[PDB]
Amino acid sequence: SASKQFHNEVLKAHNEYRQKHGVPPLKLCKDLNREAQQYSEALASTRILKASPESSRGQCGENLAWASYDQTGKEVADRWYSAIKNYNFQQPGFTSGTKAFTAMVWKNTKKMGVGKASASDGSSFVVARYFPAGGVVNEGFFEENVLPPK
C-alpha cells in the first residue's frame, strides 16, 4: 500500500543516516505507526503544528513535517537530517534546532513509527515516533548517543 511504501521509505532513509553515524538500524513498530498516524490525522484536522503532549506518547520522541503537497518518505527524512547543520560535535548536547537530527541518529533508540495525513487544502502532515526517546539531557548522553558522521 501507499502507507506501507511511505513507512519503508522513511525507515530506509533513517537507517542510511544511522549507518553513516555509526549506530545500529531502527526497526518499524506497528503500534508506533498507529500512534504517529493518529497524531498526523489530528494535525491535518486542526493545523496546529507543534509537538504532541508528552503524556500522549509514553516514552517516545517525535519529529514533525509539513508541506503544501504530499510528502515522500525520503524528503521527510532528508529534511530532518539536515538539522545536523546546527550541531557542534565539540559541544554535545540538546538544542531545539538540532532535535530533528539527534532523534534520527540517537544510538539507544531501537524502533520507530511514522504516519502521514492529508488536509483538505492538499497539504500533508507527517509524524515520526522514536522508542526509547532520544535527546534526554543528561551529562554524557549526547556524546555517547550522537556520533559524528563517517
Side-chain angles (χ1 to χ4, degrees), residues 3 6 23 44 52 59 63 84 86 102-103 115 117 121 124 131 135-136 143:
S3 182
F6 177 73
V23 300
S52 62
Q59 298 164 60
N63 267 328
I84 192 175
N86 304 131
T102 62
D121 71 343
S124 64
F131 184 95
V136 58
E143 188 166 1

Side-chain angles (χ1 to χ4, degrees), residues 52-70:
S52 62
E54 286 182 4
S55 72
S56 78
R57 44 160 159 128
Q59 298 164 60
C60 292
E62 180 173 89
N63 267 328
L64 301 175
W66 181 86
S68 65
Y69 48 83
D70 187 21

Side-chain angles (χ1 to χ4, degrees), residues 89-105:
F89 291 93
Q90 281 240 292
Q91 280 265 343
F94 182 91
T95 60
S96 305
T98 63
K99 172 188 125 139
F101 155 69
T102 62
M104 287 180 75
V105 304

Side-chain angles (χ1 to χ4, degrees), residues 111-132:
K111 302 233 186 172
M112 73 174 300
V114 71
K116 178 170 58 164
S118 292
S120 53
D121 71 343
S123 71
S124 64
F125 290 81
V126 170
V127 177
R129 293 286 171 79
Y130 302 100
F131 184 95

Side-chain angles (χ1 to χ4, degrees), residues 7 10 15 19 28 41 59 61 68 87 95 117 125 128 144:
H7 295 165
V10 171
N15 286 341
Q19 187 176 68
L28 283 162
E41 289 177 11
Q59 298 164 60
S68 65
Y87 196 81
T95 60
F125 290 81
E144 281 140 36

